[PDB]
Amino acid sequence: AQNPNCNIMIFHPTKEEFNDFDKYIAYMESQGAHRAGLAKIIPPKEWKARETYDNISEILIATPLQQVASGRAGVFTQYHKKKKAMTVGEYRHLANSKKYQTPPHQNFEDLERKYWKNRIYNSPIYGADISGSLFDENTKQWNLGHLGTIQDLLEKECGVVIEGVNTPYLYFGMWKTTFAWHTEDMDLYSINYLHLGEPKTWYVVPPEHGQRLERLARELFPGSSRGCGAFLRHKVALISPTVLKENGIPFNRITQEAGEFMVTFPYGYHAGFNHGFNCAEAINFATPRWIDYGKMASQCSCGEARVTFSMDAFVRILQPERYDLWKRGQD
Ligand SMILES: O=C(O)CNC(=O)C(=O)O
Ligand SMILES: [Mg+2]
Ligand code: NI
Ligand SMILES: [Zn+2]
């Protein structure tokens, strides 16, 4: 078995290997990458996502989210308070202000220490989940707005034609902005490209060990667990690496820099934070190997998780027994 310790693998495809996206995902899996839950892909030196980032400041962040924490430093939840709209240029200035800017630090490890020590005492503002793309239309390789759609994959594998579309999302981050422990909707893959700015640190649990994380989460968030049998679908809970180590939960960590891709694999729990002002783009995708994960994915039916239009068909076709309860949660 390849990669039996479930380490995060880093890949350096050549320009020729960068042509066929599906084939390269399948290559990475042949080497065991999926066992970690997360892989890094460094594009060939010949590649670029677009010519410059000099003209992005007029993009609108219609609903910036202030991420307010409750709990203790290593075990907390966050809620998202909606703020007034602002442009990317306005947001960048805010991120660079004395109130929100990254503190002086020695290296990534020192900054990680400061994050876990101090995150709860601040409420950074995240421009998340903004439909759109920063890839040039002429970029033909690993262009996250030109991938094969998950609807087409389901149709190719299973023969059923379904409604729905699949488009990318932009994320504008600042110091301490946080993504809570989650897997993707319907335990899909994700791909994330860091277009510009400061790094993003990731933490990930191997898919084969995801239920260990879930069991710890039910212990650590006992009221939430009683409210919903899939409350990590709410995307609000954080658990530090120190706490994970104290409870014997297998995980790995890595820092993504500008110009790098990350791929999350089906049922790979992940969480993380941004180091400073940055912009990422991400999208869900599927492969043939996903179908069995989609069929077994947990679902939130309590009403909190509320998701896209396009998840309806996935639940309806892959999980018909769960469909009626899940849809009641949607309504
Ligand atoms: O970058 C973020 O804030 C969160 N991204 C993801 O969870 C992802 O790409 O799957
Ligand atoms: Mg602009
Ligand atoms: Ni994700
Ligand atoms: Zn729920």
Curated annotation (Swiss-Prot):
Zn(2+) binds at residues 228, 234, 300, 302. GO terms for molecular function: chromatin DNA binding; damaged DNA binding; histone demethylase activity; histone H3K9 demethylase activity; histone H3K9me2/H3K9me3 demethylase activity; metal ion binding. GO terms for biological process: cellular response to ionizing radiation; chromatin remodeling; double-strand break repair via homologous recombination; inflammatory response; positive regulation of chromatin binding; positive regulation of double-strand break repair via nonhomologous end joining; regulation of gene expression; regulation of protein phosphorylation. Residues 8-50 form the JmjN domain. Its main location: nucleus. 2-oxoglutarate binds at residues 126, 192, 200, 235. The modification PolyADP-ribosyl glutamic acid is found at residues 16-17. Its EC number is 1.14.11.66. Binds 1 Fe(2+) ion per subunit. Transmembrane segments: none annotated. Histone demethylase that specifically demethylates 'Lys-9' of histone H3, thereby playing a central role in histone code. Does not demethylate histone H3 'Lys-4', H3 'Lys-27', H3 'Lys-36' nor H4 'Lys-20'. Demethylates both di- and trimethylated H3 'Lys-9' residue, while it has no activity on monomethylated residues. Demethylation of Lys residue generates formaldehyde and succinate. This is Lysine-specific demethylase 4D. It comes from Homo sapiens (Human). The gene is KDM4D. The chain holds residues 11 to 341 of 523 of the full protein.
